[PDB]
């Protein structure tokens, strides 16, 4: 199954189209897989156009006679991978030769999440508030903690993981450690993440789901 192109270099935000010409008959609908380096393939599309559960809506598949296409409508940095098409018959499975999608490095903003302490942990006398910055680049981002709008200092620690690839991103956790007393006597908890000219603050109110 010739795939086209065999490799391509693109930028974040680009629309990417990968073609797969059928080696088996066309009634044997195609499936598409994504394989990150050093990892098992992941199913994206089955029956030419059906999105497998959990796969993002930016992936879509279609057919035109003997021609099956995978489209990534808006490339994300986590889409760096080799993509494979496949037809299945009762006696024979065939893969396309693969299309390596390389993505130019650029700034990636973090997805920010804030987590209140659990009721279970408050029984220990301590409250941990956790802020997650997921999949960002480059390394430099500033975390500032606020409690009823008072900037905190000296009571948070950070930790960083890197994906260890070519288009690898960072993720970062910041943990604010408070006594149960302090946690219970204040209401608004906010994690502000500053990268470049953007700051994003995620917050919660104690006791308000």
């Amino acid at each position: 199954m010739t795939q086209s192109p065999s490799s391509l270099s693109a930028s974040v935000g680009d629309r990417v189209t990968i073609t797969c010409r059928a080696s088996q008959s066309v009634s044997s609908a195609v499936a598409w897989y994504q394989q990150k380096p050093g990892k098992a393939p992941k199913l994206l599309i089955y029956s030419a156009s059906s999105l497998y559960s959990g796969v993002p809506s930016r992936f879509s598949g279609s057919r035109s006679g003997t021609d099956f296409t995978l489209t990534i409508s808006s490339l994300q940095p986590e889409d760096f991978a080799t993509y494979y098409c496949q037809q299945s018959s009762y006696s024979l499975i065939t893969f396309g030769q693969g299309t390596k999608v390389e993505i130019k490095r650029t700034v990636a903003a973090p997805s920010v999440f804030i987590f209140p302490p659990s009721d279970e942990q408050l029984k220990s006398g301590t409250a941990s508030v956790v802020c997650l910055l997921n999949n960002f680049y480059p390394r430099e981002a500033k975390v500032s903690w606020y409690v009823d709008n008072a900037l905190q200092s000296g009571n948070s620690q950070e930790s960083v993981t890197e994906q260890d690839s070519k288009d690898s991103t960072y993720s970062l956790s910041s943990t604010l450690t408070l006594s149960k007393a302090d946690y219970e006597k204040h209401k608004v908890y906010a994690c502000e993440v500053t990268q470049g000219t953007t700051s994003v603050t995620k917050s919660f109110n104690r006791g308000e789901c």
């Binding site: 499936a31 393939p41 199913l43 009762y90 006696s91 065939t94």
Partner: protein
């Protein structure tokens, strides 16, 4: 949650055999099609084999037919790939996978199979004679760390054949071969006669001559 967990990979010799396992959990593979798919280093996915539910019909890629056997044990909820007569082209990460939605929805983590393929010429070390053995001394050559088989050994370019014992090679844990060749000679000859073992390793286009002297 559904999971496939593989085991069994490693380093093996050409012509050798290996068995890979694919342990299913969260489902019974009795009612599913299971497959093996492989990926040679830096290359694309290649289907290897499949086995069908209930009747255990099997299908193989042409490259592995007659050498690989796929099977499944429903009581152990495990599928297997028996790999015989291995070739250099079989080096790959091997994946097992379950057939789901006209496709392969769950995949194992992969296990690496490496078929030894590195040609290496031998190192030849002397087995030196003392003397403490009465009137007859032993000496020889240790032929270490070559691949693949074979090497041939003569002594004094073939002029010395009486008393020679060249042992079968042994496969070392490294995957490389080693052997020794020894000869018994009169102790009186040690001061005067030269003894040289000639080791030919055609696969690496290497010949080694080693003069063996008393230490």
């Amino acid at each position: 949650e559904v999971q496939l967990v593989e085991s069994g990979g490693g380093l093996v010799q050409p012509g050798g055999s290996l068995r890979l396992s694919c342990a299913a959990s969260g489902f019974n593979l009795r009612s599913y099609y299971m497959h093996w798919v492989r990926q040679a280093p830096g290359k694309g996915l290649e289907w290897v084999a499949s086995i069908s539910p209930y009747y255990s019909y099997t299908y193989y890629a042409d490259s592995v037919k007659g050498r690989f056997t796929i099977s499944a044990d429903t009581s152990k909820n495990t599928a297997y790939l028996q790999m015989n007569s291995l070739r250099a082209e079989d080096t790959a990460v091997y994946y097992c996978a379950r057939h789901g939605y006209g496709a392969m929805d769950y995949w194992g983590q992969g296990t690496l199979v490496t078929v030894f393929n590195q040609i290496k010429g031998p190192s030849v070390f002397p087995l030196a004679p003392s003397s403490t053995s009465g009137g007859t001394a032993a000496l020889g050559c240790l032929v270490k760390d070559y691949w693949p088989e074979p090497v041939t050994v003569s002594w004094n370019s073939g002029a010395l054949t009486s008393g020679v014992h060249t042992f079968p090679a042994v496969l070392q844990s490294s995957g490389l071969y080693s052997l020794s060749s020894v000869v018994t000679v009169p102790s009186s000859s040690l001061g005067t006669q030269t003894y040289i073992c000639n080791v030919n390793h055609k696969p690496s286009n290497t010949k080694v001559d080693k003069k063996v002297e008393p230490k």
